[PDB]
Amino acid sequence: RALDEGDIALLKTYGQSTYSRQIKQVEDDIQQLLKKINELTGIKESDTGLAPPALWDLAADKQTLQSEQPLQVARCTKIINADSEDPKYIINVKQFAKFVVDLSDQVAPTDIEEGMRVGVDRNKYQIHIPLPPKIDPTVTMMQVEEKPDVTYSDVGGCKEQIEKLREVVETPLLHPERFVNLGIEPPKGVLLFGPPGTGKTLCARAVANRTDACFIRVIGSELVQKYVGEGARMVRELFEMARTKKACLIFFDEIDAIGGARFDDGAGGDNEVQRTMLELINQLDGFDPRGNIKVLMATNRPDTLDPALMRPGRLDRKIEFSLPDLEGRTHIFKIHARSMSVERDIRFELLARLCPNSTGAEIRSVCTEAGMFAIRARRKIATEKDFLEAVNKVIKSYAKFSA
Amino acid sequence: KKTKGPDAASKLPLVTPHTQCRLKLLKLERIKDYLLMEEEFIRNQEQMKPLEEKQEEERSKVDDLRGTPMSVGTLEEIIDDHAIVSTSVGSEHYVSILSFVDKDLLEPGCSVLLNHKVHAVIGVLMDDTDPLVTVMKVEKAPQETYADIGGLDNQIQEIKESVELPLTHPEYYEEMGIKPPKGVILYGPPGTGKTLLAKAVANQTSATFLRVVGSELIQKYLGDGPKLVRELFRVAEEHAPSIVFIDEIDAIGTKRYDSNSGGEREIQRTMLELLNQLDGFDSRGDVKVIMATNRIETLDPALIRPGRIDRKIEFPLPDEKTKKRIFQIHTSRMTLADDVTLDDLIMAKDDLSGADIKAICTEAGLMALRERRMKVTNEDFKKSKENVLYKKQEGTPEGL
Amino acid sequence: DRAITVFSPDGHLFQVEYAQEAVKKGSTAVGVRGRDIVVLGVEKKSVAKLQDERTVRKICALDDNVCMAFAGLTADARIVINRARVECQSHRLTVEDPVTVEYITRYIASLKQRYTQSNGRRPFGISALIVGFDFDGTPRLYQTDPSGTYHAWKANAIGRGAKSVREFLEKNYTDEAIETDDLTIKLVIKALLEVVQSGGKNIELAVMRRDQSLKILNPEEIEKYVAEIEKEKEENE
Amino acid sequence: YDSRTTIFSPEGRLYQVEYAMEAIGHAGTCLGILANDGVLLAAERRNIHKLLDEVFFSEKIYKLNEDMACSVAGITSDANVLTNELRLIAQRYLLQYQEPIPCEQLVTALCDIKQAYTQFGGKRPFG
Amino acid sequence: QELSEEDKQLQDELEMLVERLGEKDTSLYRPALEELRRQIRSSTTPLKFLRPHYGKLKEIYENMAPGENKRFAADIISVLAMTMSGERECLKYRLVGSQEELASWGHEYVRHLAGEVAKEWQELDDAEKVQREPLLTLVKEIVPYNMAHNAEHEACDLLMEIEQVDMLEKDIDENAYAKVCLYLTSCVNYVPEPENSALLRCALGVFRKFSRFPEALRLALMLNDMELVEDIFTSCKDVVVQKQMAFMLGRHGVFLELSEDVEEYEDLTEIMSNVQLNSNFLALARELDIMEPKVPDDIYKTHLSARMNLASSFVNGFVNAAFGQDKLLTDDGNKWLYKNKDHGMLSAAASLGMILLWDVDGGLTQIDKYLYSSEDYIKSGALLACGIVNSGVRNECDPALALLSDYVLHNSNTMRLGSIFGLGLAYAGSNREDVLTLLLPVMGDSKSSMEVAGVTALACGMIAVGSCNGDVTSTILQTIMEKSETELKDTYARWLPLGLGLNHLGKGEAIEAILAALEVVSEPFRSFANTLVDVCAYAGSGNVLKVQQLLHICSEHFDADMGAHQGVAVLGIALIAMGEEIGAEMALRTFGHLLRYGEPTLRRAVPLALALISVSNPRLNILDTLSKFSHDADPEVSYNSIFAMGMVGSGTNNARLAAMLRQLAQYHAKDPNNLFMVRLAQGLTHLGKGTLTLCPYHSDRQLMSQVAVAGLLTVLVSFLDVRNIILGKSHYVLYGLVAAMQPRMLVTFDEELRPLPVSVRVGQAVDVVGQAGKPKTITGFQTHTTPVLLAHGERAELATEEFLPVTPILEGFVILRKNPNYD
């Protein structure tokens, strides 16, 4: 029952409008002109720099044409491997080259160091420009974080955890007593662990309370990556950036993939993790003890590898909290109520009692919900909006427990 | 490497009749006239040049110094005067461009020219036509509007309010000092879901939109599933603040499985990272993450909490009036019949969703076009019911 | 992970949960009280031209004062009726007073709980519901979840579309609209009629008038009640 | 996903039973048509290899009682024992009541035994 | 290929029948065709089979003897020609045919017959009026068929094709007239002027017949025929229609001068005078709680200079416009102007009048003290403030005329400038003979400077906008002739053509006489003046010739520099067809290609046309393109782009746009020339707290108010060359927004004229179904109380069918009456 050929054309011409063929021809011309004007562009030149550089900065491009014979030492750039006692430099080059050169007369051997990229002039491959690249990928820009974290009221002060860590982080940075009265160096490390909650907020508070040597938030899940050696290099530049930034503290977070689990499936399941473990130990071993740099490692469960017994000499003072009581919860309410347009005339102690061990994250969540209910009611007031504050906090506590 | 695309197309989609008539014809004539007058204008202006001033100062100073031979290479790093560019076959050059230096458009990681001989950069290929590693913004700000959907007024109002807390009245909770990126958790029957998409186009009328559907149970060792979306949402903040529509992965990729350990590492990584991004204390931006699912039961307790993921919205089945509206929308383009057989097809129907409505409307035209070709086929009054049965609803042995 | 009759890490009993979700596959079942009559309907819509409609047996009697309806697996339901009927005859043998609706519902719930117990027995993926007049006048309705439990309901609303029909019932469960037997029947209709098409003869209603036998409504009278419901719907512009 | 017979599905389906019932469609062919003053069964003889003798006089059609007859369409191993049990049930009813067993009662007994087989214990459903 | 067995059998049967009809003897010709035609007119209520018999059927029809046999034969050829058409053979056969009842031959045939009639009606020459009547009779037979079978919109197509909309009035009933008239209104926007007036006149005819006066007044305002407006106002008699007419005239801004013999005349002239406009606007502003005077400082977000302080004062007046509640210029205002430097005291006082605009009683008392100020600039600013206060709003005693008595022709240039601009804003659209006879002699003064004479022309143009005032034009031309050409064409004669364009706004055709009289002028100014008056007169018409003439002339090299008229061509590009969305979003793209490859003067004037397209409408593509071009090398291009963003976001309070301007303020903090006008753009965006919109398209965004576009165009003409004129002296020309500043909320009264709290559903209103002339469909019902800001794209609708409005158009003012079915 197909009956299409010839028939379909007749019924396509059977109905239509009186000028349906006209608009079809009109819109085909519309599309024809659309393609023509897309071909008939405006600035029809992919290369840009039309005039603002090509009128005055061009005049100095004549100067670089007069100095075109110099400034050609670019050619190719590659790392260096090692050197002899002083004059000769045995170098591995990105051209796979077993390369040695007399370093260019303008470059002293002191500046050039092993493992640094240097450009070579094709004529003689002299060490002309030893570029200190210090190039950071985008993910590494996330591993490094903001310095001025801003101080608060001990970010919901849990007096136990903060006061135990101040003598191990704040005190060494103050350096008032570490040298003589107590043994040589302050305690070798801090492990600020705990269930998802107050973890690393006290670190941020310590960062604000201390000098400009401020922490960077690196993630172990980011650190573990594809292929081999990238995680090793990432940890190395992590230490380099922290060392350069006034010897700031390095905050390792979520240490359950960089150290992995306590096991490896067949020593081939997670072996790049093991590659990162060897180099990280080589970096944060300290060698010569130094009260300048600090390291803090924070996870939720003590799932660290075998170095968990070497760290008593390197990373000691394992502390935790994430267990807010009534006094802790109500103080977190106060510091959060410092924000927004709320005032403490609300009986927020009642809601602190209602939620047993609701962390500090949920309290911030509950405060966020209270503001959301205020804007939903379209009232920007929240100082005296306490009954509405209590109502939205209790109903959302109901939803969190059972929705 | 990508900021925006030239939007010089979609010439006035508002053709009011959308059917062959004189009003539509006159609008098309005005459209086609306005195209020539522009092609007139630009052609008249480009050739009727304001002034003939030498070689437009182009061939006199720079075009010669750019040279005839050139090679294309990426630009790596920027220094005060020179530029650190990584050309082909792993070649790196520290040379100061001063001809066709558009510093804004050069950027690191972009193709630039090399004049050979004394290798100096002389230009940049701004197009470069190759940002193809992870492409999710290709479908940005979809053209679908509110009018494409109907009969869902309660949900449209709810989603609009949740997404017009920003943009509109941003000072409302700015003074309230919360800046909540709560997002929306959408329920709904499995017979729907792209309505969860069609109701999302209401907010997609403003700013851009991103989609992550199916993805994977992030077996990848780096994870980064929810984490590259965080980067893409950061890119969305760089652009107009976009939304992330993660339908069917808030359920499967974020599953409330009873298992704690040895659970494909998604529970360890994906759920935790989703909460980190959904928390406003970690990431800023007007990005609103629309979580849509057809299994409310598998809501993870972290996703259950309205404290971090608020604005829970339930999508119900269409009612009698909603079924009338959706059928009218889908059959408006097709001119079903002159008798307007509308209520007979939905009055007794139950548990019929948007996808089913689209399918039956499409199959109604196909069956008429099969052999019943009569323009407005007189059989469509009952053939619409003939293909609304269409079996295919559900089939499983007998068991009953 | 684990889907057997053992406790899961979060609690619950996942096999029992799967059995409880299996009632969705089946048919709707509504029924109400009223102190004058209990009426319950099923509204089956699947009858081929070659199958006899006698042996669908979606509602069955127990002791001429107790009747139950299907929601879920039919074979399990039929085994449940057979065992429950045997137990009603036993409780008529001993304890010469006739069986009470609460007693038989308790027995059915106990059997379901016993079958959920231990790994050997599949947890009887059927959700039953029982109406009937007790010996002391009062008619009662109990609904038994497949796991182990029974609950005395004014309206049952069990099966596919259970949520919507239960919402409709609890919305307008007016005792003044219950009153007379005809009012009760017409309240069950337009509530079960709401589920799916319900056009020609899909409704399968049942009737228990105090001390009368189990009355299965005739199709012509069902159409008459549908017409009366339509008349009530009319004049309401 | 399948496991020991007495299981369910995450949705709540008896996928082992459904698979067995679908497999019943595979292989074998019988049909029954009921008419006035006579009801008949038609069976498709699957294997017609010339090396048989056809001495059993019936393969698909089985006489189960004086007033009834059946026709299996599943695996013969379970079919034989099911037919034996069905004849035993019919004759037990005949002994108990001294009257031919009604067809519906016999079918209910057989389907009860099959429901028991698919209900409890680690026993395969009668395919 | 194998057809159906029955289909082939019937095909062979019809083959035998046509062979019988094609036989030699004609005795069997009649029976064969009797049998044939019955199944020919079967599928229409077949045609495939007779596909290859075209030549044979033509021979049979021609061979048929005249009479019954011939005209059925012509009938069959016609109904088959709809498939076998190499020409309109269907109509030529049907004209020869029976001309009996045709409608029974199928809907496809009658629709094809209708179109072929339309083609012939257009094809027939003027001398041929013999067959025109039979086609007209055929048309009058098919229109009832189209009305019954919901084909009225294509019936309108064929009647307008044959120019028979007069009998369209007599045939259409009210049960479907609303969608037909809406279809007519849509076609109005694109049809050229003579048929455009024809469809407007017939649209008035239908609505007058069906007692649909409120929308008829909307159509009359489109026709810009004040005589017809008066005629239809007299035609309607009911108290409810009388009072809604006066709202519509009052909302439009044009005062209708009538007699007191009409009932409730005092209220009609008051509501037409917008006396209660200010009281209602403040009342709704208080109800929204939007009354607090927003400081210019926290608009600037100063968390991180005389001209900059002036810009802060101007944006403060813009934000607090029409309010009259601002103590910054009231309590310590004298200190602020004393602290102010040079030329800015006039603008600061005028900005104070902007705060007090439409507040006649309150404004006059609070400006009386500043009237006696010492400085001439403060006095002139105070007088300009009085004109701004009385601008738009009409008053019974008209205090502006008496207040500006010595200053109208005062010898001091600054004092005369303030009064003249004030009278122009006041009498804008009044068309008062007394005001014209007092300001035109001031135009004739020779002691006034060139810019003073231009301001007089601006005042005369805005007062007599769209009036074709002959004596005004003669004085304008005479003043141009008397003034020497060398000093004319310097920088300030650009206001004289603007007055001519305003006076002939929306008229066209007659402009040939004005340009012919203006032909004596030398090329550098004549080529600018004639183009400006032409585009202003042909504005809102879709005359894409006038734009392409502009496109051709703006393309010339024109490089003493006469190429300045390329800019007014660019403004005219947007001005001609800014009416609907089409003709604006694509001329927008034209402006994109103007910027994309164009002259420096061209790219200077493009953002002005971009702002004119979508003033007060924050389209995303416009905002992005303007922001990207706000950093161009040419300073004037940057200035125009900054102001364009302010205008497109004006009266919107668009949060993201305001953030963009704040970023621009940080970008342009080093250079104050861009900085103070970026502040100006922000003040425009927050002008009147966004309560009053600046788009000159009102009454469902499809009516051109002459006064508002006159003031708007004056600002854009000033912004053609602000790189010279705003820097020098024109700190007063920015106050022309008063005409374009109209409130965009809903004020609901009742039959007793009291504010109603009736709630309405507001949301996006865009077309969903285009099957016919259906009303625009609204989505997104965010219903609340009646004060709601009506922006572009979104409209309002009553929540329930309980309150019946005087007009379905829901903007500005409206009266809601109790429905008879309300319960």
Ligand SMILES: Nc1ncnc2c1ncn2[C@@H]1O[C@H](COP(=O)(O)OP(=O)(O)OP(=O)(O)O)[C@@H](O)[C@H]1O
């Ligand atoms: N004691 C506290 N007082 C106030 N807010 C707290 C407290 N503890 C946690 N929070 C809140 O919890 C959120 C995240 O807390 P924090 O930064 O300590 O953890 P994290 O880095 O997200 O990870 P984890 O929860 O696994 O430790 C923030 O919004 C923070 O305000």
Ligand SMILES: Nc1ncnc2c1ncn2[C@@H]1O[C@H](COP(=O)(O)OP(=O)(O)O)[C@@H](O)[C@H]1O
């Ligand atoms: N109520 C409705 N009105 C108009 N269009 C709809 C409606 N519901 C769905 N659609 C359209 O039908 C398509 C399928 O809808 P949906 O049911 O969301 O898909 P799926 O069931 O595959 O998830 C969508 O792309 C949407 O545009």
